Amino acid sequence: KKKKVYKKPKKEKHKKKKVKLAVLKFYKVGDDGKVFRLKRQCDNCAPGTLMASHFDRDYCGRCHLTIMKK
Partner RNA sequence: GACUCAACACGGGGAAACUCACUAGUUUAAGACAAGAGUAGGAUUGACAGAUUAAUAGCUCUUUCUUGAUUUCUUGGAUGGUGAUGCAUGGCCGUUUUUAGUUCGUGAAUAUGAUUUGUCUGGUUAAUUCCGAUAACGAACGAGAUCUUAACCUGCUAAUUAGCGGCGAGUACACGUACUUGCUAGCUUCUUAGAGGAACAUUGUGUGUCUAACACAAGGAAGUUUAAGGCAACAACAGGUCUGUGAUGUCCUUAGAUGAACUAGGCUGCACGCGUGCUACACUGAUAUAUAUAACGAGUAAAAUAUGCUUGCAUACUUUUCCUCCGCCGAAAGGCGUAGGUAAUCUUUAUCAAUAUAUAUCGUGAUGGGGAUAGAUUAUUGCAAUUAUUAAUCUUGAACGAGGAAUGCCUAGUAAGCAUGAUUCAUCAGAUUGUGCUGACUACGUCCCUGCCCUUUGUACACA
For binding to RNA (CB under 7 A), which residues are involved?
1, 4, 6, 8-18, 20-22, 39, 49-55, 57, 59-62, 64, 66
Instruction: For RNA, give the closer residue by CB, 1 or 32.
Output: 1
Cβ of residue 36: shortest distance to RNA, in angstroms?
Answer: 16
Cβ of residue 65: shortest distance to RNA, in angstroms?
Answer: 8
Q: What are phi and psi of 26, to 5 degrees?
A: -65, -40
Cβ of residue 34: shortest distance to RNA, in angstroms?
Answer: 21
List b or e across 6-36, with b for residues whose CB sees 16 or more CB atoms inside 10 angstroms: eeeeeeeeeeeeeeeeeeeeeeeeeeeeeee
